[PDB]
Symmetry: C3
């Protein structure tokens, strides 16, 4: 049996909302350590890692590790029927059902939901703690705007250490944010260009953290990192 | 006939309540009240509108009148005015509506719809609920994403549904919530039709689900100082 | 040519005014002030924009520039325009630069394009001054009734399948009426076109006469005006 109670179920609503557009399903490494998820879109050009430490959950119980096949299309639709509700996630031992219980502040309205888990168990490999050439911390909003505004112009953005440049039939546009909350560290300067479509899939996680961190290097994929307070982090990986 | 209602919002929110359920209806323009009673196209629901002349600030209506009205057409006319405008209605056979504040006047071509209203009897109900309107809305809405049928059960009330992605049950315990349960009943109602009734939520916050086997459910909304909007639904 | 406008929102609300009515127009960039004159694809109405160089902080126009821009493309490239962003234009391609420290810069391709008529000041029998937003709802609320208002001297009238609808106003922001009574039926669909320029000012003047097209005029704060010439239906 797996039982996690989250007083601010809003965390779960925003997280499911974040990855909903990128992947539809994933193996959840429901472990006593925490909830780790590793998954990839249908075009196999991006990877999403979600870390949810058991410390953040007010009550966490996981007798027996478990890899859940979650249809995140159904889960996010379920979690929408809840922003202050206390969400508890209960997974009975060897049931095809993941239970999601929504308890209001006032114990007046309680709603219980069941989802049909699937068979998706892929043994997640592990990335290394890598050293990136130039990394940038900026407001999540500005990164959303830069990705959104430059998307009406071109299908891809050109990032350089910082300048965001995208070109198209309408014209060309260069957006540069100098240091100030913005902080650039460029050990070795790198110029990599990324498809804007998938970046705007990552920008759906902007309600999780106020600051987004972009790790770029020529020998590794881009790493957009949104941090979940206490619980952990949400790492997006994209290839040039 | 002439009726002046300062709180023109009441007239706006009413028409917006029924535009989706019924498209046309007869209006029993009576010296007592503006009673309307019509049924949907598919014959699975009935609305009854009571507008006491007491709520109308100036109410004339001498000779008794049965107006057939195209609510869709009237809804657009009534949604032209803002929630602050003062609304007056006049007739002799073309419904006239005037909106004060700049003053604007429109005229709606009435139609020929005179089906004789029938008498509904005050029935006893096994279970009767009084919840805050907002809860009833969300409860209906969220459950509709799951499936298209709510199973309202009653214990000294639970809304439940089962669908393709899963199954759900929402339980509410005793604004405020009251559950007079003479006999415990459980029924299944179509959520699409219920979500037409929730369009009358701006009228007031007290929604009352008078519910009982052997009779159709009656979702009642209460227009303040005037009358009430009763929504009847047939179990499946 | 370089023209820096600090109240960048103006050019935002400007381009959004013409974006719908005119898809392509010629900006005759001039030393006194940028002027635009173009007509819709149905040739029933003309818009004339006047933005004087006095409003722009720095303004240098060392030529008779005739930029054929694509207003649809410019309303787009006028996105990422924070309302308080400061926007400057330069001089075949049009550059736009936005400054807040984010400092985005854009470049636009320009079409090659027709001349400009010399519209004269002309005598209007009935001129009406009303609150700008009130005009929009008058057109919008009446629009659900019919496809044409009948403006009289001031009452607006529409007639449709649902029924007739009349809205009236009296002298009193406020309302100001003027010489000879006129009643002209005007196309509604093109009247709501002009109402998209309401964010630029709080007063609209329905300068209206019988022997000439109606002139809905909006006064851009300080910098100039935005005139709309709509012909009556018959
Ligand atoms: C052994 O070396 C590998 C190499 C690549 C992926 C892999 O698997 C994973 C490991 C860790 C984390 C996530 C995944 N992969 C996944 O989770 C998803 C399963 C469904 C989902 O959860 O979205 N696999 C695919 O998309 C996929 C299917 C088939 C071929 C592919 C080739 C390249 C990229 C992806 C695929 C294992
Ligand atoms: C799983 O966790 C990881 C961990 C580290 C990297 C990673 O890769 C990616 C990361 C971000 C974006 C895109 C990709 N992935 C890619 O760019 C392409 C897609 C293949 C294709 O173009 O069809 N390669 C593979 O996925 C692949 C093929 C064969 C063998 C492999 C062995 C290990 C890892 C990947 C492969 C996936
Ligand atoms: C967290 O994902 C990671 C993390 C770390 C490594 C990594 O990829 C590898 C894995 C094993 C062995 C070698 C490589 N890496 C390489 O072979 C070269 C290094 C340069 C060289 O050829 O010397 N980089 C790439 O292929 C590559 C570049 C950019 C984006 C990419 C996205 C997906 C796959 C590859 C790339 C993927
Ligand atoms: C004789 O006993 C009855 C029994 C049932 C309904 C009835 O009619 C009404 C009574 C009061 C108020 C309004 C209506 N009638 C209506 O609402 C509309 C027309 C007027 C309107 O749309 O407002 N008729 C129908 O729905 C309808 C048409 C044909 C057969 C039906 C069978 C069952 C249910 C409805 C119909 C009279
Ligand atoms: C009008 O005022 C009323 C008054 C009382 C009941 C009523 O009925 C309903 C109320 C709410 C929801 C749905 C229905 N209606 C129904 O349940 C079904 C229609 C379902 C179907 O045909 O699939 N029957 C009839 O309405 C009907 C058929 C024949 C003769 C009748 C004589 C009197 C009353 C009704 C009928 C309508
Ligand atoms: C305001 O709507 C009403 C109100 C009150 C009665 C009523 O219906 C009747 C009218 C005259 C005589 C008998 C009945 N009642 C009945 O026939 C039986 C009771 C037992 C019996 O008499 O055989 N109830 C039902 O059919 C029925 C159940 C559920 C929902 C329904 C919705 C529409 C129509 C019927 C039902 C309709
Ligand atoms: Cl997928
Ligand atoms: Cl972390
Ligand atoms: Cl109908
Ligand atoms: Cl009552
Ligand atoms: Cl054109
Ligand atoms: Cl002027």
């Amino acid at each position: 049996m797996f039982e996690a109670r989250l007083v601010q179920g809003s965390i779960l609503k925003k997280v499911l909302e974040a990855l909903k557009d990128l992947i539809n399903e994933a193996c959840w490494d429901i472990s006593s350590s925490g909830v780790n998820l590793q998954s990839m879109d249908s075009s196999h050009v991006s990877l999403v890692q979600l870390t949810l430490r058991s410390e953040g959950f007010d009550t966490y119980r996981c007798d027996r590790n478990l890899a859940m096949g979650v249809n995140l299309t159904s889960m996010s639709k379920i979690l929408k029927c809840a922003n202050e509700d206390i969400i508890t996630l209960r997974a009975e031992d060897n049931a095809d059902t993941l239970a999601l219980v929504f308890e209001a502040p006032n114990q007046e309205k309680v709603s219980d939901y069941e989802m049909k888990l699937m068979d998706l168990d892929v043994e997640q490999l592990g990335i290394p703690e890598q050293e990136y050439s130039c990394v940038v911390k900026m407001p999540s909003g500005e990164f959303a705007r830069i990705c959104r505004d430059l998307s009406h112009i071109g299908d891809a953005v050109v990032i350089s250490c910082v300048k965001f440049s995208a070109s198209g039939e309408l014209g060309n546009g260069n957006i540069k944010l100098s240091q100030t909350a913005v902080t650039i560290e460029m050990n070795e300067p790198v110029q990599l260009t990324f498809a804007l479509r998938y970046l705007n899939f990552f920008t759906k996680a902007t309600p999780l953290s106020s600051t987004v961190t972009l790790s770029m290097s020529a020998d590794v994929p881009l790493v957009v990192e949104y941090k979940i307070a206490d619980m952990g982090h949400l790492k997006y990986y994209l290839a040039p």
